[PDB]
Symmetry: D2
Subunit: 329 residues, 4 copies
Amino acid sequence: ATLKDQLIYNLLKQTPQNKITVVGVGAVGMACAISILMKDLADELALVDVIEDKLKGEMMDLQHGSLFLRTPKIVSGKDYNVTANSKLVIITAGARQQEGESRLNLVQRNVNIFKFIIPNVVKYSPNCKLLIVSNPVDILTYVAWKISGFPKNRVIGSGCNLDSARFRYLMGERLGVHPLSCHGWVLGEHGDSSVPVWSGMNVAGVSLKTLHPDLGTDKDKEQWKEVHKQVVESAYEVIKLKGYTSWAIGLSVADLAESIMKNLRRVHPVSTMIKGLYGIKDDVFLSVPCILGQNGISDLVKVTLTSEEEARLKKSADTLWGIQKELQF
Amino acid sequence: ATLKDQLIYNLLKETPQNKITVVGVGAVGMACAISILMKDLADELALVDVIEDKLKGEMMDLQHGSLFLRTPKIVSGKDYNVTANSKLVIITAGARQQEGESRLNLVQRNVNIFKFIIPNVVKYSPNCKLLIVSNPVDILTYVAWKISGFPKNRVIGSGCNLDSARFRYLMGERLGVHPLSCHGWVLGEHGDSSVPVWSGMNVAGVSLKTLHPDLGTDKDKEQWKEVHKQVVESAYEVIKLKGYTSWAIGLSVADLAESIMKNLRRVHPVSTMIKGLYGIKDDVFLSVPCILGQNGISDLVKVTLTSEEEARLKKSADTLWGIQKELQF
Amino acid sequence: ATLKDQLIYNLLKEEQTPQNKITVVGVGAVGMACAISILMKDLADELALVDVIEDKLKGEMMDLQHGSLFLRTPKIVSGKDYNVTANSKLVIITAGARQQEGESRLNLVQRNVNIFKFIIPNVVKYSPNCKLLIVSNPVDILTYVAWKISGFPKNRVIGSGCNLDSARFRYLMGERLGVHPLSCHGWVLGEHGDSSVPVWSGMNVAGVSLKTLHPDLGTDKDKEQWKEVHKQVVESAYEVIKLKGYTSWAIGLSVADLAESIMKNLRRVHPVSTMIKGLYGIKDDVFLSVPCILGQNGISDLVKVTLTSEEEARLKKSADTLWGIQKELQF
Amino acid sequence: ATLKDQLIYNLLKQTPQNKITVVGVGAVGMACAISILMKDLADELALVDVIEDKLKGEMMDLQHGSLFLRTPKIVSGKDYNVTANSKLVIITAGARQQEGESRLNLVQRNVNIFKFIIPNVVKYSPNCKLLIVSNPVDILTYVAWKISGFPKNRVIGSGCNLDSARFRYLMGERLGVHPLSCHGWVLGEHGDSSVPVWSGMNVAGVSLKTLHPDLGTDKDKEQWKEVHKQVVESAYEVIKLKGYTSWAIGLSVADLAESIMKNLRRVHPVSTMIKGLYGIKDDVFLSVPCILGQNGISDLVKVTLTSEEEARLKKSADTLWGIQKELQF
Ligand SMILES: Cc1nc2ccc(NC(=O)CCNC(=O)CCCc3ccc(CC(C(=O)O)C(=O)O)cc3)cc2s1
Ligand SMILES: Cc1nc2ccc(NC(=O)CCNC(=O)CCCc3ccc(CC(C(=O)O)C(=O)O)cc3)cc2s1
Ligand SMILES: Cc1nc2ccc(NC(=O)CCNC(=O)CCCc3ccc(CC(C(=O)O)C(=O)O)cc3)cc2s1
Ligand SMILES: Cc1nc2ccc(NC(=O)CCNC(=O)CCCc3ccc(CC(C(=O)O)C(=O)O)cc3)cc2s1
């Protein structure tokens, strides 16, 4: 007999139970992959792309690391049959912006890619949650929704989770407190029109605006408004410095994956439909704080905004709705 | 008063306890960084390189994900003062081989680079453990030892930890067993002359050489010798496919870092001086299984080797000493 | 509207079935050590506890619930009714009598068989596709009993077996050699009890056979008395019971170890109780510990460990002992 | 040669680097121990008690599970020399209250115990942080402080970290949100006079009191005041039901240990001196939100309280001072 058979007696004779697929093995895709692998979120990871050498190479490189992981199956392919029965499918494919390019300028390029990807994802994993990372993520989350046919709870855009993480990091550097204990939301577009929620910023429940009423105004002698400018400009400052971003967005997406896979019902600011709220009457998607778990977005927190904060959100919605008029599928 | 002072009353005006430094922010050094950040091994991470924009960009990308990590200080710098008081300094700087180029051919380019790097690391963290990853890692570990002036125990080459992981991966695929439960050691050079210890290969304490005497010979109908050949050619196969390797060596390095930082006294196959063993009489460094903890390599396991397995290790020693003795520093 | 409705707009008021649910039956020290271990290893999205003493139970559930801020397992439930265990992937049975200082595990048979006659059919009614992980003693025999009562195929009925004995062996090996038990390999097989068999021929660090370096290893003439290491494995539960009254932490971690391989489908190799009819000359439905490959379908394969003639002799003895007691069963 | 010498060649034959001592091996001590071992916060764990057989037995039980942990050294003893060079020493020793007995009634018994324990801890780890868990914790932190001669940043009482955790769990049940995303602080005494800071209660930065002004009053149709009553009654109801409490406090204390050992500078409600705040003029210790890291309590968050919230806290302060002022040691 073979060595395998001399050594091993087989009793039997199985479908993956916590499978994650990542589409796109660019830097963002592979940061998402590694982060998820190291947080033990998946019993199977699947990677898909269109460049076959790059794809196989990536798969093999993670495979070689299996001894150090707790994810026992890693697969890849151009064919989406390798994505079958995923619980979560993370879409990181597409064009990405140059220095001085708006994320909104990526829309026709990435919409066209999504018309191929999304029906194939849906084909093999019709009960998955779809986490859109590709940009402009707010429009692409709407597009993925209309393409997939999924109910809106299962279509989630990474949105402002990373913007809020950035905001909280900067808030932490200013206050001398870990970002975990710093609270504050950047909502709306993941992009130039994002809205800092000054009214909700706090440490230990203590409202920062309550202690410092100029917070968020141009008069402000500490210039806190510049912390939001830095959040808006981060992706560009980093692209200018290393040519792309990868690690933070990967971590931000693993953070969201963790809340979905383990059904935590944590609150995250993610892209979803906000028609009906804040005076918006159109099918705009943008980020508001949502309750994330095993059915995706089960609930929305209806954050209370000052009139200035609400006017900015509405302007973000109007901007996104304008670009949404360009959509053909 | 400022918002900080209104909010926070300070008791203490007053150095990191568990600091790690990664030198080199190429794919390998950033995979080392992310893996370490996600295993919570450090209370501070320092990054160093010569390219200032890329360095800053990398640091910032990591920093923006701090909400999702438990490492409160991330710093970078061309200047090695950012690395002061590190427990562990991981060197990933250097030239990397092209397709069809042996790692051995990188020796003088990377020795040159080490003549700058090593005294600067040593300057600012004289009590650190030096984990060498740059290639040829066996000879470079020897070079790191001579330049630094550290005792043997605090200069550790990543060595064949990765090769053995690859081996165990390929063993697991054949056997339908997780690599954690597959045992087998690849020793000597991290390179073309690496020695597979067929005599040690087992699952659950069962000697596969005893079950299958053809194991590790070219006549073997199952062709187990090809498993080692796939280990030798792994890096080149992945380089051919994706241009470089990163994730497996990252994970392998965070595996070593874990044992050093937590003083685990686990056994890894890593590059150390083997003078005195198997009839090697010069200051040759290569991989044997070593006990790793907070003082680095505290002990070597004297692996018992068939006369051929020993002949192959003496051959790897010779190749290395050949290159090693023609170096000036 | 209410505060909840002012703050929160709901998309779904519609629950899924549990996806990664684990039940633990029995909330004694062992049961709760399993529970806390599982909770801090993030193996479950839902933990159900069952026992027959209602105040003890509610209080344990509440104590865990109070730590939820520090855990990542969102749903923790309890009840005497087995309807709280519905749709479990893995049901861990820790229920029953435990041995006094000086009492054999084999003396718990009749008491715990009767208990299982109530427990097992209840568990099967609400989770007919779960894996059963028997921890209660004598674990080899109670795994057989769980198997016969449940009607499950034998891949889904796993005894905690000698996973802990082997973990103790490795720890002691580690103290003698100066090496982490992770890097010490050695297998104790057969009964989780006095007739367990230390496999000297497979003991190794780094694939270096200790038996090969030290030919007397595991013999009485052994000047280093390695045989005493197995004796300490055998006596461990007893020295611990003698000192603190019971054991909990080590068995809790051992079970969590097994749960991890099952829930994440690792196909790692563990010495657990399973049926070994057809191996080593055993021809009856004996259950005992051999190295098994553990994954999402329970035990998918068995490693056929090669044993010296003495080591096989002792295992066949261990098997005969347990087959003996298996004759004590009436259903 | 022995088997160990044939197998292992020793290079090198050091102090404890990340050592935690737990004093008291009752249910709370051991729940602290297991929690810390499973979070990898220590490279050495020491246990201390007076009942020598229980102590030995608990050590052994932990030791036998070593294969499944990453904490390589576990030691115990009646003699405090096993605790030497601890970074963090956690005091869980003492009498505990009966069902229907106030933690304040434990004071004399546990003060007398501390007179033996505290100088013994200080002798062998003069630079440690002291985390007092024994009850009444606020008073015993003050006592530890006076006995030890430590600066006040290095003497931390577990205080209301558990109370706030219970609060957040209960809050989370009512709202359908994970406690991580529910925020609200219980301050003052760890016991009957604790103060719920209704003004700081929020999800996603949204003030619950702004939305629902009867929050925290007896009129309240939704009876939110009962959430606090349940926090206060928690240890009593758990004691009644299972006879003691262990798991929630163990986790809470590891949460604290985590912030100290990893130098995270998160904010926790923990016992410290608050003389000079909220019009308290005595050396009262009680819980307020403090920044926790490697020097213990570096900073205090000066929470903004309603006049009633402040009234309640001054009332908490008075109750404890009424006991503190009587003590002599
Ligand atoms: C028919 C077809 N099927 C496929 C299948 C696969 C692929 N594969 C690729 O396209 C791989 C290459 N593409 C990328 O990696 C795009 C990454 C986008 C990105 C970059 C940065 C950030 C975060 C960042 C910011 O938001 O700007 C910040 O804020 O930091 C977010 C998102 C192509 C096709 S075509
Ligand atoms: C004076 C100076 N100071 C500095 C300071 C920093 C830098 N920085 C850099 O040099 C960054 C760029 N260089 C790299 O990243 C080299 C990576 C080497 C590598 C690649 C792959 C593998 C694993 C692999 C295999 O072994 O081949 C397998 O087997 O998978 C191992 C090692 C330059 C200088 S110059
Ligand atoms: C109809 C009914 N339904 C129920 C439902 C629940 C309960 N609940 C309880 O019975 C709770 C109390 N029972 C225990 O906790 C027994 C634990 C057994 C144990 C002890 C130690 C070790 C490890 C040890 C060794 O193996 O000896 C070593 O080696 O360290 C393993 C196993 C009763 C009933 S009655
Ligand atoms: C000279 C001497 N040296 C020593 C050395 C060791 C020992 N050893 C013991 O005394 C061990 C037994 N003691 C305990 O375990 C006391 C636990 C205290 C406790 C219980 C519950 C909660 C949380 C709880 C609540 O606050 O009520 C809630 O809110 O849940 C907090 C604290 C005695 C002596 S005498």
